[PDB]
Design a protein around this nucleic acid. Sequence first.
RNA 1: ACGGCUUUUCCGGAGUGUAAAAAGCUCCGGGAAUAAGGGCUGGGCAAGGCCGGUGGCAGCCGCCGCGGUAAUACCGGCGGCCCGAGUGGUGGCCACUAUUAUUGGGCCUAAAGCGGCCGUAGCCGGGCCCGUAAGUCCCUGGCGAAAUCCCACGGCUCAACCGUGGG
Lengths: 129, 96, 173, 229, 146, 57
Amino acid sequence: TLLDPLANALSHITNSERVGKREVYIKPASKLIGEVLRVMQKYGYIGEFEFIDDGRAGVYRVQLLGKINKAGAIKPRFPVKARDYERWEKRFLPAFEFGILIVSTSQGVMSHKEAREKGIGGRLIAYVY
Amino acid sequence: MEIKITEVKENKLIGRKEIYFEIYHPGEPTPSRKDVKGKLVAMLDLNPETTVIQYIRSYFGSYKSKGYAKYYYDKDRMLYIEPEYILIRDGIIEKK
Amino acid sequence: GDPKRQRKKYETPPHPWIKERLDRERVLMDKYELKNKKELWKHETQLKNFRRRARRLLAARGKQAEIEREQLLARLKRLGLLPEDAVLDDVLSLTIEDILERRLQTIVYKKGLARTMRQARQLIVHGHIEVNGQIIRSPSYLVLKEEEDTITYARTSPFANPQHPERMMIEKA
Amino acid sequence: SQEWKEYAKRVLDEWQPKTKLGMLVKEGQITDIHEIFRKGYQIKEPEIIDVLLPEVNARENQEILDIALTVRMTDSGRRVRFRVLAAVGNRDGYVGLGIGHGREVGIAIRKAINYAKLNIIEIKRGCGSWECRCRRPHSVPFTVEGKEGSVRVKLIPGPRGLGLVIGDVGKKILRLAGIQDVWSQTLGETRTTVNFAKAVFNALYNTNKVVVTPEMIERYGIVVGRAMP
Amino acid sequence: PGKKAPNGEFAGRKLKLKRKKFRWSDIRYKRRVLRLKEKSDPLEGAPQARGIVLEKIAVEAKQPNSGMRKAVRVQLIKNGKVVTAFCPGDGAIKFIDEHDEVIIEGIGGPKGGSMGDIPGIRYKVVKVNRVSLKELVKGRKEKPRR
Amino acid sequence: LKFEIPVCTSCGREITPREHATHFVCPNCGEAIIWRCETCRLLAKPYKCPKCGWEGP
RNA sequence: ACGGCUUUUCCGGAGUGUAAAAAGCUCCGGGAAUAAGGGCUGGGCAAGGCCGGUGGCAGCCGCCGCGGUAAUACCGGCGGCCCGAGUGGUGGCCACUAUUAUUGGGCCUAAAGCGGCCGUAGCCGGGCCCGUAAGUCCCUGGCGAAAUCCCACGGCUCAACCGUGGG
Ligand SMILES: [Mg+2]
Ligand SMILES: [Mg+2]
Ligand SMILES: [Mg+2]
Ligand SMILES: [Mg+2]
Ligand SMILES: [Mg+2]
Ligand SMILES: [Mg+2]
Ligand SMILES: [Mg+2]
Ligand SMILES: [Mg+2]
Ligand SMILES: [Mg+2]
Ligand SMILES: [Mg+2]
Ligand SMILES: [Mg+2]
Ligand SMILES: [Mg+2]
Ligand SMILES: [Mg+2]
Ligand SMILES: [Mg+2]
Ligand SMILES: [Mg+2]
Ligand SMILES: [Mg+2]
Ligand SMILES: [Mg+2]
Ligand SMILES: [Zn+2]
Ligand SMILES: [Zn+2]
Ligand SMILES: [Zn+2]
């Protein structure tokens, strides 16, 4: 059965970009998927996106631009401290400032660069580069 | 040899003065205790009977030696305070 | 547990017979007149340790990291391996030849107190060289920049006489 | 560079091109090596590389990676064949790899050197290490991977002065491409030299497939082809 | 086979038990922890041992080699067990006699066992009547008491 | 100076050194140059001229 | 082979050193005098296609493999290579090894999916709103002896070692 809406969305996006699709539909929507999409848009990995209302949990329509090498969820959602980001960067990223780790903090969802500037930790939930 | 006085300190509790010095002597052997004592007592106007040389030390690749000596104002205080071995080694008293 | 054991200050090669490394090390040994491989290996290790400290300090941040960062730079310029306006990245361009040029043997030969590297080694071992008024008999001693120019014949040496037969032959070169 | 300039001049004037791209090179409509890539051209004449990149004919810019002898069975005994794997480059940003066959070693060596030129590629270089951020093109700009047969190769950016932390075949290939420092990780049968070399070559080619931003070019000091001071 | 399991955040106990269970499939780990080698070693964990020679023998080399390898039967002082030991060198068997005492050590093959074309022999002679056998075979020294 | 790396008109990715790409002038107007990478040609992706707007293979 | 130089080390002395001695250290007289070994030499793996013996015998061989009268591989001579006051042999642990795999392995044909299915504990679990604050993140009080580890400076000729500060 379905266990993880966010993992399905990111695997779907990475499959679609590899064959040159220009847009995708993320079928079970949720607020967390929306926050992740906002962060992805801020750094230029996707274009415009919009919420579409069924009678169900909603749908997201997303525009792709061919700027994603890879994107995926992080399971389990490891806790991380405010001065410990480097080893996770070496685990998931290809060079010292290449890409973003997406972090859930008690101040919201944000990239690991913004959280490191604020001086806070949180829970890792995704990577994109 | 040329002698330079580095420090003279007063110790009233024991009743003595403590003297640290250097000796410069390129190309010569380490100076003897007798010569150092004679030069020191001339240089400071001391009664030589109450002047004890603690040590003279040479170093690996040096032309100078460092030395430590003590001067008591009273002979009996010297005999009461100082160990027997140092007074014998300095020729102040005779080994039995 | 176990009490402390004193450990070697140098590292050995991971494979004893690699042709290219053997050729490179033979050239260095001939040029600087070193006595054995371990001596050379000692200096190699010193270099490695410097680089390992720079690699760690580049990727660090905080308050103790800065103090360590400036201490590393200060020590490197005191030994004479970097100029006064160098930065941390310059640590990564140091070579093994930079360290060997700081040996007292090399510096005694460079200044013109001996005619050959071998003669400089014998002069050091026999006690004819003074460094800032002190006699030192270790040819591998690394000379600080502040004392480099106060390096002469010992004032009690036979060579401290411009009419000595062996000194005139050294001066003829 | 004085020798190879006149070598290139000598080759050019006595050469009669048999292909369209060879004609473009003969008539002076193409004057730089970088102009033959990224447009789908077929490259079939070795004189093209000899004119545009003459220094691949030097002895220090060629390496014979390995020599094997293989056997075909017949009713009149064993028929022997030589297989030679070789590589060339300019030690700046261009590298090529080839395989040759023949009845004697010299024929195979000649053909292998010839096919390496025709398989030439251009790559990207930079600096991407967490513990060295110097913007000079001494390493790979970011982590890359390649594969062939059972062999998988992963290349990782390294600090300046580290050296090439990789097996010897990889060392030779990376040196010919103009890279000085790297870390690596491998899976599979590295003793199969043909596959090891092809996996490293594929990894070098794959530096062109990563998407990058103008900001990244400044940050990692990315250089395409010649460093060009 | 699906995804490797368990991956969950709160599944530490099961993951640890899985790793412990399949570690017993590694023959290196099992032999060390159960101390199987100690249970059957005639040398009782020692690097060398002393024994007394009972007779001289010869062992044929394995195919496709040909030749006779000279050895001795040795009774160990510490526990009385009897083992076969090789005598290395050209003419070395001539320096050995019955009732002599020898020092033996491992022959140096794979997995701490035998080597070469003589399987079945695990040890070699190093000293004879407290004199190095290598010297005797070369010269430089004489075997005492005749 | 340096040189610019050509970019596919359909998807916008860079063209790699030895792929089976193509480029040609716009069939309708002839004022712009169309580039097509190997992947877009294989999947028959549509393209659009940036000047006259004529589209499609 | 000639000509010259030096004295770390060596031999004999004076001083200092020491509880007393001995080492050590400063000076004086003599003199190149008093001082090189162990392993290896077919491939892995740096180094001989030379000579004399032996002749599937003797022997070598971590592994692959040599030796059957024209042996670069055994024994010896002469050469050569590596390390060097050390250099070889045997046994153990780590690495090699992603051959124990969280990071990070496999299960159609190579070792390996229970003959099939139902279900208990455990692990894993769909979207929205409000509350809580156990997990989780940030700040700050009290603790986790010294020695041991890293850095700078200072004392033994430098170092090893030892001290003062930072971690
Ligand atoms: Mg205990
Ligand atoms: Mg037939
Ligand atoms: Mg394939
Ligand atoms: Mg394998
Ligand atoms: Mg060789
Ligand atoms: Mg052996
Ligand atoms: Mg012969
Ligand atoms: Mg021989
Ligand atoms: Mg496996
Ligand atoms: Mg089944
Ligand atoms: Mg069930
Ligand atoms: Mg939920
Ligand atoms: Mg709390
Ligand atoms: Mg403590
Ligand atoms: Mg000092
Ligand atoms: Mg110090
Ligand atoms: Mg201390
Ligand atoms: Zn760099
Ligand atoms: Zn395209
Ligand atoms: Zn148009």
